[PDB]
Amino acid sequence: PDQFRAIIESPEGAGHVGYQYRRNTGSTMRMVSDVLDERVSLWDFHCDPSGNVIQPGPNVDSRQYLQAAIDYVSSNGGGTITIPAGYTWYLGSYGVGGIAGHSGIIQLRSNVNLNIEGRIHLSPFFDLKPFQVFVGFDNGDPASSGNLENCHIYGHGVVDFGGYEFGASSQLRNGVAFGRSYNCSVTGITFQNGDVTWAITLGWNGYGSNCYVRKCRFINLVNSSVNAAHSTVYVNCPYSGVESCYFSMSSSFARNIACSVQLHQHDTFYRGSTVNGYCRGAYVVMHAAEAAGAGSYAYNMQVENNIAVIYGQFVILGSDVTATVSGHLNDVIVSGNIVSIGERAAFSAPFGAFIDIGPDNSGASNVQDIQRVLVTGNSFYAPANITDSAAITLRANLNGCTFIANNFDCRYMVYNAPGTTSPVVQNLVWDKSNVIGGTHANQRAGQNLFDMQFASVVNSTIEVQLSCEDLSMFSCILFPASCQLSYSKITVDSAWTKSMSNTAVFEGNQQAGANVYVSYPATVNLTSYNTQGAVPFFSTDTNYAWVTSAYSLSINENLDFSPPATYTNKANGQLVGVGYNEIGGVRSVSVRLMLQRQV
Amino acid sequence: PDQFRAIIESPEGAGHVGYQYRRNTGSTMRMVSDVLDERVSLWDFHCDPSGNVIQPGPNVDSRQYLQAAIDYVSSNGGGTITIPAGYTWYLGSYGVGGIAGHSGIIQLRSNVNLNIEGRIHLSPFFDLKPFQVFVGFDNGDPASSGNLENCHIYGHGVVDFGGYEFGASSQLRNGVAFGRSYNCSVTGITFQNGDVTWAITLGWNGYGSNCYVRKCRFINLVNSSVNAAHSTVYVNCPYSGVESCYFSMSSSFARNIACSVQLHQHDTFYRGSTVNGYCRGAYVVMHAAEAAGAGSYAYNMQVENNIAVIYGQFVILGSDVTATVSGHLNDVIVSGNIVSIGERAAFSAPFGAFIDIGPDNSGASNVQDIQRVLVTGNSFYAPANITDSAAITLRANLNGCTFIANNFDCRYMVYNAPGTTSPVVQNLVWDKSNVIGGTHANQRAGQNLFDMQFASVVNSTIEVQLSCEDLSMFSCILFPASCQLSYSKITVDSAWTKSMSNTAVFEGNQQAGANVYVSYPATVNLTSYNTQGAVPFFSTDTNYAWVTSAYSLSINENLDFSPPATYTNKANGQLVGVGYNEIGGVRSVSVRLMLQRQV
Amino acid sequence: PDQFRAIIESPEGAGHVGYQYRRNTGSTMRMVSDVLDERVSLWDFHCDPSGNVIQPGPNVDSRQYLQAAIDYVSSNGGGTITIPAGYTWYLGSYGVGGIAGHSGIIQLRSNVNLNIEGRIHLSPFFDLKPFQVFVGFDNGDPASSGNLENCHIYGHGVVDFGGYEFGASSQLRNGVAFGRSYNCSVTGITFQNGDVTWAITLGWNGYGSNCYVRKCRFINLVNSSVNAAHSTVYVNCPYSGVESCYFSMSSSFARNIACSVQLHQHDTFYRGSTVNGYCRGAYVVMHAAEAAGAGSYAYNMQVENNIAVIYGQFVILGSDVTATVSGHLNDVIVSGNIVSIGERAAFSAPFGAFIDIGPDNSGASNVQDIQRVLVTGNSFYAPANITDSAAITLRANLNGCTFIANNFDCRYMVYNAPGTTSPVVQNLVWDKSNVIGGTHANQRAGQNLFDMQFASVVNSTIEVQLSCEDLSMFSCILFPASCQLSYSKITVDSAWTKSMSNTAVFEGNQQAGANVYVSYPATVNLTSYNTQGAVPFFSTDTNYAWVTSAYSLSINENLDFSPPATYTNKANGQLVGVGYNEIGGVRSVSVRLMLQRQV
Ligand code: NA
Ligand code: NA
Ligand code: NA
Ligand code: NA
Ligand code: NA
Ligand code: NA
C-alpha cells in the first residue's frame, strides 16, 4: 500500500497501470509502459546521469544523448527515433570510435531511422573545422567498414550548419554520409546555412544500393572563398537517385564551384528537381578510382525533367582511368530538362553549356570512353551577352552522343576552344530536329555557330537548320585544317542563309573525302557558251571537283535565256550545266546554288 | 494517501506516474504525461468549458476546438495535430479576426501541421455562402499579412465541401488558402463534393516559396451553373508545383469552366497527374496584377508527363499588363503529356486545343509577350466529329513557340478564327518531326489544315508532313492576303499530296517575298518547241516568277520524248526546262512538280 | 482504497489515471487510456485467450491476431494498425470465409490501413502451396464481392515470401490482392524472396479506381522452373499506376517469364522505375475477358522515364476479343525510357525488343485493334551479338504506332519472322528523327535492317537514316513479294550508303504503286548518243518505269563530257537525261543516283 504508491511514482510506475485497447475484451491485457514503449524519442535519452531530463539549447551538446538513443534502438533490432518539433537540438562535439576518422558527429546504425521533426543545429565548436554530421561507416577505413542497411531520415525538420565558413580548403564537410549504404534514404528534410562539400553522400565507391533523396531542400550550402568544391548530393552506389528536390544557392562562390548532384554509379537518376544559383547541374561520371563496389562501367544514367538556372554547365560527362582500372560511361539519357544560364557577364563564371564533355581531374582529354548518350527534348537558354554559352562544349575525347529534338538558344551549338585540347570525336549526332534559337543573332561576329575545333571527326552527323537570320556569324559550321573529317554527314539547310557569304567552311577541303556526305549553299559565278538553244554554263572557278550535284536557289530575272536548274562537275573542278539561250550570246550570271556531295 | 488517489484521478494524474523507456536504466526518468505530451490530437481540445470531451457529428461545430488546438501548438513553436480517423469533424461557423476578410473557417499557423486522417465536412450553415476552409493569411488585407511558414497538411483523410452550390457567381470558395506561404504543402488528401473556385491556392501575388501539392485527389468540385470559374490548384508563388495528383469532374458545367491547375509564377511545375472531365488542363500565365512578390516574369514553367481527358484547351499561355507593370512569359516546356478531347459535339464546349495562345481577361490580343516555349513529345487526340480541335489555337500575339516531335491527331494543326483577332506572330516553329494524324481525314471540306489567320508571320517555320491522304481539305496551309509573311520557311512534303488540287495557298502571293523560303507541289501544264533533240519546255501559265527551281514528281508515259526533270524560271513568270525529243514535234504535257523557292 | 489499487492494476487502470495535454487548462480532461486508444498496434491483439501477450517468432502463427486487429479497427470506421519494427511476424495458416476461395491469408478491410514497420514472413506451412497474403475481396466469387476502399499499406517494413518454390505451375501466388479496390495503395514496402505470380494486384476486371504503388522494392520474386508466369504489379483498375519503384530478379527463370508491370485498364501509368533481371518491362493490353468494370477500351496508357535491363521485350502491346466483347487499345505514350537487353547469347531468351506487337494468349494475330501509340525520346541498346534484338517486333495486326526521336541501337529496326504470322499493318510511322545506332554494324550478313515480313503495309512511313556504315546488311529495307504496299512513304537517306549494293528492295516491285512515294540510292549504267553538245544519256536497263526523277550522287571524273545531273524516265523503263559532250562520242558511265518516285 505504501509500497504501491511508491511503485507508481517510481520509473516502473507505468508498468503497473493496466490497459486494454478501447476496453476490448479480446485485446491484450497490457501495461501503460508497453504502449509507451511502442514509440521512442530523443527525450528518452536526453537526460543527466541521475535521469533528469535536460532541455536542449545553444549551451547544451545533445550529441551523446542522440547517440545513446541510436545505440539502444539498434540493440533491439531497430525502430524510429523522433527528434521532436518545437525544439532546436544543438550538436557540440565530435563522435568517437569508427566515425572519428570521418570527423563524424553522430553514427547512424542499421534499421534505426530518424524522424527529424525539430531542428538540428551545429554549435560554434565546429566553426572553421571539418565535420560530417551523420555517418554510416563503422570504421575509419571505409574499406574495412561494415554496411549501413535500412536507415531512413525523414520529417519536416531542419539540419542547419550554423553558417560557419570552412577553415581550410582541404577540409571536408558533409550532412549525411551514409557509407556503404543499402536501402537508405532521406526524405522531406531541409539542409541549410553552411559551407560544406556535400549535403548527402550515398554509397562508398560503388558499395551500396537503393539509396534515395526525395523532397528535400538544400539552401545556401556554400558561403566562402575557402570552399574548394561542392556537390550537394553525391550518388556513389547503384540503383539510387535524387528526385523532387529543391536546390538553391545565393553566394557568388557557388556560381563558380557548386554542383547540385553527382551520379557516379550505374542505374542512377536525377529527376524532377529545381536548381537555382549553382555553377553546375549534374556530373555524370565513371571515375576509375571509385569502381570497387559496382564495376568500372557507369551505365543507365538518367537526368530528366529538371528545372535549372545555373552559371556554368548543366550536365558534365566524364570518365577516367587509374593504373589498373579503366572507367567507361555509356547508356545515358538527358531529357525534358528546362535550363538557363543566369544573368551574368560573359566569361565571369565557368563556360556556359548544356552538355560538357570534360577532361579528367588532372586535365587529360585522351582517357575518356563516353558513348551511347541521348540528349533529347530539352530546352536551353542563355542571355544574348553571354559569349561563353554552348549547347555542347566538347573538350575531351568523345565516343558518341546523340542530340534529337532539343531547343538550344545560346551562342554556340558545338564548341571547343582552339589552341586547347584536340578531342578525338566519334558518333556525334546532331539531328535536324534540334531547333537553333535566335537570342544571339547579331552577336556572332568572328564566330562559327558549330566551331569544330577537334583533332578528328568520324561517323558524325551535323544537320544545321536555322530558324532565323544571323548574318553576323562567320559561318554556320567550320572545320579547321587540323581536323580530319571522314565517314560523316554535314548539311546546312538553306533557309535564312541566302545572304551568308560562308555557310559551311572546310579549311582543309575535308568535304572532298570519299565518305563525306555534305550539302550547303554557295554563290557561284557561271559563264555560258554563245550557242542559241540548249547551251552549257560553266563555273568560272575550279574548286568544285568534289561536288556531285548542285541546284539553283536563285530566280532568273532574264527573259532571253535561263541558266541550268541543276549542275554536275568536271575533272578540272568546274561546275557544268545545260541551260537554254532563246537568243544566242555568251551569258554571265551569279547564282546561289545548293552544293551537294553524295546526298 | 487520500491525497494520492485524488491526484491520480485528477487531470495531473499522468504527471505522477513514472516511466522509463523499456526499463532502460540509462533512459530519462519521465512521467506518463511527458510521453503523452509528445503527440497531440483534436481530442485534446474538443471539449466543453468544463473539459468534458465532446463527440463530433453533424450537430457539433468543431471549428473553435480545432482553432484552439492550432493556436496552442503554435504557441510552443509548432508540431503536428492529428484529426483522428474513424470520425467526421464538421465545421459550422466562420472564423474571426484576420481571416474574416477571406471568409475563413480555420486559420493555419506557422510550424503547425495538420495530419488529417479522419473526415472534415462542411455543415449546411455554409450552403449558398462563400468560404475558405483553411486560411494562412493573418490579415484581411493580404498586403498587410504576415507569412505562413512550414505548414503541412497531409494524411489519408478527406475534406468534403458538403455539395452546397454557390449562392452567387461573385462568391469565392477555397479549400486551402495558404497565403504568403513558404515551405507549405498538401499531401495525400482527398478534396471532394463541392462547388468551389479553387481547392488549394499557394502563395499570394508572388509572395511565397516551396509550396507543393502531391498525391492528392480532387473529385467533383464544380456542380452548378452559378459557379463563375474554377482552377483546382492555383500556384501563385515561385519554386512550387503540383505533382502526382488526380483530378476528376463529372458535371457538365466543369466541361465549360474548370481548369485543373494555374501556374502564375516562375520556377513552377505541373507533373505526373491525371485529369478527367475538365474544360482545361493548365493556365501558364504572367498576370501583371500579380507580379508583386516575385517579379513580372514567369519563366521556368513546366507541364510534363500528365494524362488528360478535357473538353477545351490543354495548356493556355498568356501574359498581360497594368498601367505600371508589364508581364512576360518565357522559358516554358510542355512535354510527355498524353491528352484527348472527350467525346462531345462540335462547338459544344470551348474550342478544343492542345496549346491556346489566349487573349487577356478583357479580351485584348495585343499585350502578350510570350516566347521561348518548347512543346515536345506530346500526344493529342480529338474524335473525328470535333471540328473545333487544334494543335494550337493562336489567338493573340505570339513572340515564339517551338513544336518538335509531337503527334497531333485533330482537325486543325494551326488555327485562328478569321474575322476575329489578327495576331502578330514571331518565331512559330513547327518542325517536320511533328506527326499529323489521320482521324479527321475526309472531314475537312472547306478547311485549311494550317489556317494562318494572322496579321503577320515572321521568322517562322512550318514544315508540313502528312502521314495519310486527306483530299477533303481545301489546302494544307493557307495564308490570307491580309497576312504578311516574311523571313520564313514554309514547306509541304509531297507524300500523300499527289491528288491535292491545292497544297500551299498564298492568297496575297506572299511566297514571292525576298526572304521567304518555300516548297510545295503543284500541277503545271507545259508545251515544248518542235525541235528534235534537246528541246525547251515552257509553262503555259506565267505565275512562277518567284520559283527558283522545280522538279518532276510524275512519271513520263512517253517513249518518243521526255520533259525536263528540272526547271527554272524566266522573267515573265514561265517555268523553263530542257527535255529531249527523240523525234521532233511540239509536246504538251501536264506534270506534277515540286515548286521550290530558295530551298 | 483497496479497490483503487486493484482498479489501477486491472486492465481499466489507465482509464482511471487523469491527463490534460501539457497541463493546459483549456484542454480536454481525459484519461491515459483515451490517449493510448488514439493508436493501435498488433500488440493489442497478439495475445492468448487469457489476454497475455504472445511473442512472435518462427513457431507462432500471427495470422488470427492480425485478422482480429483488422476486424476490430474496421468496426470503428477505420484507422491504421502498426506492425512493429524490431520483430518478425510469421504467418502460418490460411484465412477463412470469403478469402478462402483466393487462398487468402489475411483479409484487408475498408479504411483500415497497415503501417508495416517490422517484417512479415511466411512460415513453411506454405511451402509448395498457393497463397495470397493480403486479400481485399470479401467473397470467393469476385463478381459477388463487395469493394475495398481507402486501404493503404505503407512503411519501411518487409514482406518476405520465405523462398518457397511453387508446388505446381497451375498454382497462383500474390502479395497484395486488393480486389475491387478504390483508393488503395502500397508505399515504401519491400517484397522479397519468393516464387510468386504477382506481388501486387490492383483492381479486378476493371473494377476499382485510384490505386497506386509507390517507392516499393520487389526483389527476387521468381525462383523456380515451376513458376508459369510472373507480373510484379498488375494494374487492373483505371486511374491507377506504379511509380518510383525498384524491381530486381536474379534467377535465370525470371529472364524468360517475368514482367515488371502489366497495365490492363485506361488511364494507367508506369513511371520513374528501375528494372533489372526481368524478361519484360510492361504489358500494355486490353483483354476482352477483363472489360467488365471500366469498358472495353484501354486508353491513356503511359510508360515513361523508366530505366531497365531486360532480356526479352520492354513494352508489349496487345488486345483481344471474346465471343461478346472486343478489346481495343489506343492512346498510349512510351517516352523517356532508357532500356537495354542484358548480356546474353543470341536466342537464349525471348526475342529482344523495345516494342512488341504481340499475338493474343492463344497465339492469334488477327484480332488486335491497337492504334494511336506514340513512342518518343527513348533509348534502346542491345549488345552486338544479340541477333534477336529489334526496335519493334511487329507480330500481329497493327492499326497504328508512331516513332519519333528515339535512339535505337540493336540488330533490327522493324522485324517480323518470315514464315510466321503475316500481320496487316496500318499507320506505322517511323520518322527520320529516329537515330539508328552502330553497335551491330558488320553483324548483319543476310539481314534486312527493316525486314517488312507482313501481309500488307498501308498509310505507313519509313524514313531510314543511317548514322554510320554497315555494308554487311543485305538491305536497309526489304519488302517480300507477298507484302502489299500502298499509300506509303519509304525513303533511304543516302549518307553512309554509297557502297551498298542494295538499299531498298521491293521483291514484288511494290514501289511502282500509284500512291507509293519512295526514294533510295541505286547504281545505274548509262550510255549516251554520239552528238557533240547537249546530248541524251539513257540507262542500259529498263527497270525504271516507276521513277519520277533521279539525280547524281557521283562525281564526274571526265573533262570532255558530263552526264546529266538529273534524269527522268521513258515508257520503256529507261532513265533519260541531258548531259553535255564538249567533244563528241558515245559515252558509257556507271553512276550512283538517288531514285525518286513522287517525292
Ligand atoms: Na546515342
Ligand atoms: Na588532326
Ligand atoms: Na522555343
Ligand atoms: Na496584316
Ligand atoms: Na500515333
Ligand atoms: Na499479302
mmCIF file of C-alpha atoms in Angstrom, chain B residues 201-358:
data_model
loop_
_atom_site.group_PDB
_atom_site.id
_atom_site.type_symbol
_atom_site.label_atom_id
_atom_site.label_comp_id
_atom_site.label_asym_id
_atom_site.label_seq_id
_atom_site.Cartn_x
_atom_site.Cartn_y
_atom_site.Cartn_z
ATOM 1 C CA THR B 201 -4.071 28.183 -53.554
ATOM 2 C CA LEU B 202 -0.325 28.515 -52.977
ATOM 3 C CA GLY B 203 1.204 31.924 -52.449
ATOM 4 C CA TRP B 204 -0.213 35.371 -52.844
ATOM 5 C CA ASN B 205 0.768 37.554 -55.806
ATOM 6 C CA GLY B 206 4.180 36.039 -55.989
ATOM 7 C CA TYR B 207 4.883 36.009 -52.252
ATOM 8 C CA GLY B 208 5.802 32.564 -51.064
ATOM 9 C CA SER B 209 8.179 29.755 -51.982
ATOM 10 C CA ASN B 210 8.492 25.976 -51.931
ATOM 11 C CA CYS B 211 4.859 25.119 -51.834
ATOM 12 C CA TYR B 212 3.687 21.784 -53.216
ATOM 13 C CA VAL B 213 0.637 19.652 -53.795
ATOM 14 C CA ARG B 214 1.393 15.937 -54.061
ATOM 15 C CA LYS B 215 -0.696 12.759 -54.256
ATOM 16 C CA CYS B 216 -3.962 14.498 -53.614
ATOM 17 C CA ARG B 217 -7.291 13.776 -55.168
ATOM 18 C CA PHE B 218 -9.796 16.388 -56.306
ATOM 19 C CA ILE B 219 -13.212 14.996 -57.041
ATOM 20 C CA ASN B 220 -16.376 16.705 -58.189
ATOM 21 C CA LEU B 221 -15.557 20.271 -57.146
ATOM 22 C CA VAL B 222 -17.869 22.142 -59.557
ATOM 23 C CA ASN B 223 -21.558 21.404 -59.544
ATOM 24 C CA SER B 224 -23.600 24.381 -60.614
ATOM 25 C CA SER B 225 -24.368 26.948 -63.311
ATOM 26 C CA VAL B 226 -23.736 29.663 -60.715
ATOM 27 C CA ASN B 227 -20.002 28.911 -60.401
ATOM 28 C CA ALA B 228 -18.125 31.591 -62.357
ATOM 29 C CA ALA B 229 -14.791 29.815 -62.684
ATOM 30 C CA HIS B 230 -12.684 27.101 -61.283
ATOM 31 C CA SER B 231 -8.955 26.274 -61.101
ATOM 32 C CA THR B 232 -8.320 23.328 -58.807
ATOM 33 C CA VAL B 233 -4.739 24.247 -57.730
ATOM 34 C CA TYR B 234 -3.603 27.853 -58.111
ATOM 35 C CA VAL B 235 0.185 28.219 -57.918
ATOM 36 C CA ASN B 236 0.947 31.835 -57.116
ATOM 37 C CA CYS B 237 4.380 31.679 -55.611
ATOM 38 C CA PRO B 238 7.644 30.543 -57.233
ATOM 39 C CA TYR B 239 9.600 27.314 -56.694
ATOM 40 C CA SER B 240 6.295 25.495 -56.216
ATOM 41 C CA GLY B 241 4.167 22.918 -58.029
ATOM 42 C CA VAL B 242 1.733 20.085 -58.352
ATOM 43 C CA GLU B 243 2.704 16.514 -58.889
ATOM 44 C CA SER B 244 1.164 13.056 -58.946
ATOM 45 C CA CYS B 245 -2.373 14.266 -58.338
ATOM 46 C CA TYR B 246 -5.727 13.057 -59.551
ATOM 47 C CA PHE B 247 -8.403 15.447 -60.809
ATOM 48 C CA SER B 248 -11.944 14.427 -61.782
ATOM 49 C CA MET B 249 -15.142 16.226 -62.568
ATOM 50 C CA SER B 250 -18.500 14.863 -63.678
ATOM 51 C CA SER B 251 -20.763 17.921 -64.010
ATOM 52 C CA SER B 252 -21.470 19.438 -67.335
ATOM 53 C CA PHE B 253 -20.585 22.875 -66.062
ATOM 54 C CA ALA B 254 -16.987 21.714 -65.308
ATOM 55 C CA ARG B 255 -16.551 20.993 -69.024
ATOM 56 C CA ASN B 256 -17.022 24.676 -69.714
ATOM 57 C CA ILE B 257 -15.459 26.395 -66.695
ATOM 58 C CA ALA B 258 -12.958 24.152 -64.857
ATOM 59 C CA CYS B 259 -9.161 24.114 -65.110
ATOM 60 C CA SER B 260 -7.029 21.678 -63.157
ATOM 61 C CA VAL B 261 -4.029 23.924 -62.445
ATOM 62 C CA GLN B 262 -2.926 27.509 -62.954
ATOM 63 C CA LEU B 263 0.783 28.337 -62.793
ATOM 64 C CA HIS B 264 1.332 32.040 -62.227
ATOM 65 C CA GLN B 265 4.941 32.446 -61.100
ATOM 66 C CA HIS B 266 8.411 31.397 -62.118
ATOM 67 C CA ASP B 267 10.015 28.060 -61.467
ATOM 68 C CA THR B 268 6.693 26.231 -61.196
ATOM 69 C CA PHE B 269 5.595 22.843 -62.402
ATOM 70 C CA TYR B 270 2.659 20.561 -63.071
ATOM 71 C CA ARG B 271 3.685 16.934 -63.482
ATOM 72 C CA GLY B 272 2.622 13.301 -63.476
ATOM 73 C CA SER B 273 -1.029 13.968 -62.901
ATOM 74 C CA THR B 274 -4.267 12.586 -64.305
ATOM 75 C CA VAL B 275 -7.198 14.776 -65.299
ATOM 76 C CA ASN B 276 -10.734 13.850 -66.373
ATOM 77 C CA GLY B 277 -13.878 15.837 -67.063
ATOM 78 C CA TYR B 278 -12.285 19.334 -67.010
ATOM 79 C CA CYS B 279 -12.531 22.093 -69.583
ATOM 80 C CA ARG B 280 -8.844 22.887 -69.272
ATOM 81 C CA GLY B 281 -5.528 21.339 -68.194
ATOM 82 C CA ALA B 282 -3.389 24.298 -67.078
ATOM 83 C CA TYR B 283 -3.187 28.048 -67.466
ATOM 84 C CA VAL B 284 0.503 29.136 -67.628
ATOM 85 C CA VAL B 285 0.443 32.927 -67.328
ATOM 86 C CA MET B 286 2.185 36.064 -66.075
ATOM 87 C CA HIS B 287 -0.598 38.410 -64.928
ATOM 88 C CA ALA B 288 0.822 41.900 -64.284
ATOM 89 C CA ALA B 289 -1.707 42.290 -61.467
ATOM 90 C CA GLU B 290 0.074 39.521 -59.528
ATOM 91 C CA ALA B 291 3.749 40.498 -60.023
ATOM 92 C CA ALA B 292 4.424 41.968 -56.582
ATOM 93 C CA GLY B 293 6.383 39.185 -54.806
ATOM 94 C CA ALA B 294 8.496 37.545 -57.482
ATOM 95 C CA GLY B 295 8.845 39.970 -60.382
ATOM 96 C CA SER B 296 7.000 40.469 -63.685
ATOM 97 C CA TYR B 297 8.418 37.451 -65.477
ATOM 98 C CA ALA B 298 7.001 33.967 -65.440
ATOM 99 C CA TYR B 299 9.841 31.704 -66.552
ATOM 100 C CA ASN B 300 10.858 28.096 -65.971
ATOM 101 C CA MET B 301 7.350 26.753 -66.292
ATOM 102 C CA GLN B 302 6.972 23.014 -66.738
ATOM 103 C CA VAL B 303 3.954 20.928 -67.728
ATOM 104 C CA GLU B 304 5.051 17.348 -68.136
ATOM 105 C CA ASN B 305 4.004 13.754 -68.160
ATOM 106 C CA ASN B 306 0.296 14.292 -67.477
ATOM 107 C CA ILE B 307 -2.636 12.285 -68.694
ATOM 108 C CA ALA B 308 -5.745 14.223 -69.548
ATOM 109 C CA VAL B 309 -9.245 13.955 -70.961
ATOM 110 C CA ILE B 310 -10.533 17.501 -71.327
ATOM 111 C CA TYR B 311 -13.212 19.346 -73.295
ATOM 112 C CA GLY B 312 -11.481 22.647 -74.122
ATOM 113 C CA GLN B 313 -7.762 23.516 -74.030
ATOM 114 C CA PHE B 314 -4.930 21.636 -72.524
ATOM 115 C CA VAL B 315 -2.343 24.403 -71.919
ATOM 116 C CA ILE B 316 -3.273 28.010 -72.086
ATOM 117 C CA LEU B 317 -0.460 30.591 -72.390
ATOM 118 C CA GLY B 318 -0.928 34.224 -71.553
ATOM 119 C CA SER B 319 0.549 37.436 -70.329
ATOM 120 C CA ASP B 320 -0.866 40.903 -69.790
ATOM 121 C CA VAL B 321 -0.151 44.339 -68.430
ATOM 122 C CA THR B 322 -1.358 47.004 -65.983
ATOM 123 C CA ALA B 323 -0.747 50.769 -66.068
ATOM 124 C CA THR B 324 2.643 50.317 -64.304
ATOM 125 C CA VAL B 325 3.663 46.673 -64.831
ATOM 126 C CA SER B 326 4.117 44.505 -67.916
ATOM 127 C CA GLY B 327 4.021 40.745 -67.644
ATOM 128 C CA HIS B 328 6.222 38.437 -69.684
ATOM 129 C CA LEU B 329 6.064 34.729 -70.111
ATOM 130 C CA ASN B 330 9.096 32.809 -71.317
ATOM 131 C CA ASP B 331 11.080 29.605 -70.934
ATOM 132 C CA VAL B 332 8.208 27.128 -70.805
ATOM 133 C CA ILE B 333 8.333 23.366 -71.544
ATOM 134 C CA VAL B 334 5.308 21.191 -72.335
ATOM 135 C CA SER B 335 6.389 17.611 -72.756
ATOM 136 C CA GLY B 336 5.384 13.985 -72.457
ATOM 137 C CA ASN B 337 1.710 14.675 -71.983
ATOM 138 C CA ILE B 338 -0.985 12.416 -73.418
ATOM 139 C CA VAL B 339 -4.179 14.384 -73.890
ATOM 140 C CA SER B 340 -7.524 13.893 -75.608
ATOM 141 C CA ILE B 341 -10.679 15.879 -76.123
ATOM 142 C CA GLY B 342 -13.525 13.804 -74.633
ATOM 143 C CA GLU B 343 -16.489 12.700 -76.594
ATOM 144 C CA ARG B 344 -18.644 15.759 -77.393
ATOM 145 C CA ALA B 345 -20.474 17.558 -80.165
ATOM 146 C CA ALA B 346 -18.566 20.015 -82.197
ATOM 147 C CA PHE B 347 -18.717 23.537 -80.676
ATOM 148 C CA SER B 348 -20.495 22.259 -77.518
ATOM 149 C CA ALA B 349 -17.653 23.400 -75.218
ATOM 150 C CA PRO B 350 -14.736 25.806 -75.506
ATOM 151 C CA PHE B 351 -12.689 25.282 -78.696
ATOM 152 C CA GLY B 352 -10.548 22.163 -78.380
ATOM 153 C CA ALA B 353 -6.784 22.772 -78.324
ATOM 154 C CA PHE B 354 -3.531 21.318 -77.147
ATOM 155 C CA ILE B 355 -1.982 24.765 -76.862
ATOM 156 C CA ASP B 356 -4.037 28.001 -76.734
ATOM 157 C CA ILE B 357 -2.428 31.449 -77.041
ATOM 158 C CA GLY B 358 -5.210 33.245 -75.364
#
